A paper describes a structure:
Complex I couples the transfer of two electrons from NADH to ubiquinone (Q) with the translocation of four protons across the membrane. The L-shaped complex is structured into a peripheral arm that protrudes into the aqueous milieu and catalyzes electron transfer with one FMN and 8–10 iron–sulfur ([Fe–S]) clusters, and a membrane arm embedded in the lipid bilayer that mediates proton translocation. We have determined structures of the electron-input module of complex I from the hyperthermophilic bacterium Aquifex aeolicus, encompassing subunits NuoE and NuoF that contain the FMN cofactor, the [4Fe–4S] cluster N3, and the [2Fe–2S] cluster N1a, respectively, both in the air-oxidized and dithionite-reduced states at resolutions up to 1.8 Å. Here, we show that the redox state of N1a regulates NADH oxidation in complex I by inducing a conformational change close to the NADH-binding site.
To ensure that the methionine residue at the homologous position in the E. coli complex does not change the local structure, we generated, purified, and crystallized the A. aeolicus S96MF variant. The mutation did not impose any substantial structural changes, although the hydroxyl group of the original S96 is no longer available for hydrogen bonding to the peptide carbonyl of D94. In addition, the larger side chain of the methionine residue displaces two water molecules, while another water molecule shows up in a different position. Still, the flip of the peptide bond upon reduction of the S96MF variant is clearly detectable. Accordingly, statements on the A. aeolicus enzyme can be extrapolated to the one from E. coli.
Residue numbers in the entry:
A (entry chain B): 2 to 419
B (entry chain A): 6 to 160
The structure:
């Protein structure tokens, strides 16, 4: 049928896996997916034990593509040591600034995600799976609902899938504008019909999740890897990129590059290579000043030779690369990051509620040259004191990127201090 | 207050979709905002009854989620990204073009109730910055002439 208008985000791949079809900016329906050998990995998976599938996903070195990079197999193993029923949740909230990697899988190759969900659900013994897609992805929502009907039609969903005795329904839930609803416990609260308030962890969802039951939450891009792991075997999958951080990775690249878009590359690719080898270098061939890893980290031009992997010295995060060049004001950019966290704190934790607000409100005064000496000292203090008593990652990192700009671009901040 | 049959039928479809009625709350509110061009406060008591939830639960949920608007009826929501990448690449040019064409700023509605500009955080299309939506449709802003063409399609 007809879907809402979607901008045609550029997509390029060196691996031809996640983006084999999604490199073309249009919906690939079940026939095209089947033509490329789609749903054969599901047929293979259903002739394996759930435990075998977990073992392959473990040995694959697949890490959470949501941004934390938690080992996916090890998450599943924690879930299955707890009695059922169990739930599988696909996190499609994708609301990090600069981050548009998951939507191109959803909107262009939805059956890659659906096949991943069915295999993962079977591996953990979940008969009920959810996609939680952000409200601002209405096309993604309608495309997934249509795709799910296609899968049902072909007998990949419903009861007794392909005579396996395995039952699965996939329910598509929509967000309604809250970044925090991407936090796995806030997501689950939203699925339960409530406000997106994160829960104290532990327990982690794999112990106590949806309706208090063992629940695996995985990112769109994580799940999209599962069909490849089963199809190729974990061994062949480990041939892709470095053996310790293996498999394809999507890199959404934006700001001051000639070729902004999503790049499928191995995680041994360096940040410099992403910008200059793949994204066509900078607009006007201007010097890179900084790279914002979404709203999480700020890397200086001295940090471009780092691997795009989940290693301690790696880029990590979502793989999100926002490029700022020599004429971009770092304090102006820090203000946009502060404004983001101000708008998105859920307010359960006091230092997060007041800290996100005050960090933005004071940094606006600093930017407009209306800050008192007290406001300056205030801004520094609140930036270092958003984290205390926080029960989720938003409070933990709301000051992180901005602190890194203060440390890495002091001369620029000092200009504002006068 | 009563839901017109064509809306009530859609609401019941959402309530029947998930295993538990209360899971349908955001799909129902999206559906109500789609029908009326906002969330009528009088709509919330009947929705609570259909979801078998307390009214205060439903009111709290409407308050929490930024896409829901209880204040202004608008046929078309022009959602304009004001986050880091769209700001770097020309949110201000988009807002200037929107003001030149429609005579309104963020948070305002045109006198005919046709268009409301809604400033939003990152819409997840940052490579196509600066980004805007017109209801469910999403676009890169190129220029005032191009924006005028796009807007002419919404009648
Ligand atoms: N994709 C997007 O649009 C967004 C992504 N993010 C990402 O979110 C990340 C932070 O996520 P969190 O869930 O707070 O990180 P985390 O590191 O606390 O947890 C990561 C995952 O591992 C699981 N896990 C961790 N320790 C565990 C344990 N002991 N036992 C069992 N399971 C365990 C968690 O349940 C979760 O599913 C950031 O790095 C950021 O990149 C944040 C906002 C938006
Ligand atoms: C404030 C906040 C927002 C988050 N938003 C998302 C999101 O939109 N998508 C996502 O997959 N993970 C998001 N996460 C991370 C999830 O909590 C979780 O780690 C992830 O979905 C697990 O999947 P993965 O292991 O496959 O990465 C968010 C975390 C926090 C703290
Ligand atoms: S840290 Fe912030 S966003 Fe997270 S639960 Fe606490 S108040 Fe909410
Ligand atoms: S910053 Fe505007 S779409 Fe992401
Ligand atoms: Na097609
Ligand atoms: Na897309």
């Amino acid at each position: 049928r007809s879907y809402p208008a979607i901008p045609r985000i550029y997509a390029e791949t060196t691996l031809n896996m996640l983006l084999k079809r999604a490199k073309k900016p249009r919906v690939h329906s079940i026939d095209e997916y089947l033509k490329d050998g789609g749903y054969q990995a599901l047929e293979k998976a259903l002739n394996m034990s759930p435990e075998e599938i977990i073992d392959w996903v473990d040995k694959s070195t697949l890490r959470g593509r949501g941004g934390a990079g938690f080992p996916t197999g090890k998450k599943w193993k924690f879930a299955v040591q707890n009695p059922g029923p169990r739930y599988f949740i696909c996190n499609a909230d994708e609301m990090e600034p600069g981050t548009f990697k998951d939507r191109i899988i959803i909107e262009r190759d939805p059956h890659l995600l659906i096949e991943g969900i069915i295999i993962s659900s079977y591996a953990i013994g979940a008969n009920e799976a959810y996609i939680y897609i952000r409200g601002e992805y209405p096309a993604g929502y309608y495309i997934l609902r249509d795709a799910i009907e296609e899968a049902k039609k072909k007998g990949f969903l419903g009861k007794n899938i392909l005579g396996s005795g395995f039952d699965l329904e996939i329910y598509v839930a929509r967000g309604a504008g809250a970044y925090i609803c991407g936090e796995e416990t806030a997501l689950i609260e939203s699925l339960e019909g409530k406000r997106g308030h994160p829960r104290l962890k532990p327990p982690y969802p794999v112990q106590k999740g949806l309706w208090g039951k063992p629940t695996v939450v995985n990112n769109v891009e994580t799940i999209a890897n599962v069909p490849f792991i089963i199809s190729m075997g974990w061994e062949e999958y480990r041939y892709i990129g470095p053996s310790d951080y293996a498999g394809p990775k999507l890199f959404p690249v934006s700001g001051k590059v000639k070729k902004p878009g999503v790049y499928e590359l191995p995680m041994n690719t360096t940040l410099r290579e992403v910008i200059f080898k793949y994204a066509g270098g900078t607009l006007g061939n201007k010097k890179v000043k900084a790279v914002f890893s979404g709203a999480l980290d700020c890397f200086s031009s001295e940090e471009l030779d780092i691997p795009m992997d989940y290693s301690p010295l790696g880029f990590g995060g979502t793989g999100t690369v926002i490029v700022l060049t020599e004429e971009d004001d770092i304090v102006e950019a820090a203000l946009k990051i502060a404004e983001f966290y101000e708008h998105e704190t859920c307010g359960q934790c006091t230092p997060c509620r007041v800290g996100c607000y005050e960090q933005a409100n004071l940094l606006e005064k600093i930017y407009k040259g209306e800050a008192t000496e007290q406001d300056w000292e205030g801004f520094d203090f609140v930036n270092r004191n958003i984290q205390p008593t926080s029960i989720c990652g938003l409070g933990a990192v709301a000051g992180r990127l901005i602190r890194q700009t203060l440390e890495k671009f002091p001369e620029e901040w000092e200009k504002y201090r006068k | 207050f009563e839901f017109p049959e064509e809306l009530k039928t859609k609401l019941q479809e959402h309530i029947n979709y998930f295993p538990k009625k209360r899971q349908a709350i955001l799909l129902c509110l999206h559906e109500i905002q789609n029908y009326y061009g906002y969330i009528p406060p009088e709509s919330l008591k009947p929705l609570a009854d259909m979801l078998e939830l307390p009214l205060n639960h439903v009111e709290g949920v409407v308050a929490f989620y930024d896409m829901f608007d209880r204040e202004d009826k608008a046929k078309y929501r022009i959602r304009v990204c004001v986050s880091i990448v769209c700001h770097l690449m020309g949110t201000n040019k988009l807002l200037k073009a929107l003001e030149n064409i429609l005579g309104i700023k963020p948070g305002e509605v045109t006198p005919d109730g046709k268009f409301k500009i809604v400033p939003v955080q990152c819409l997840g299309a940052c490579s196509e910055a600066p980004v805007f939506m017109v209801n469910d449709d999403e676009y890169k802003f190129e220029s005032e002439v191009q924006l005028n063409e796009i807007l002419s399609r919404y009648t």
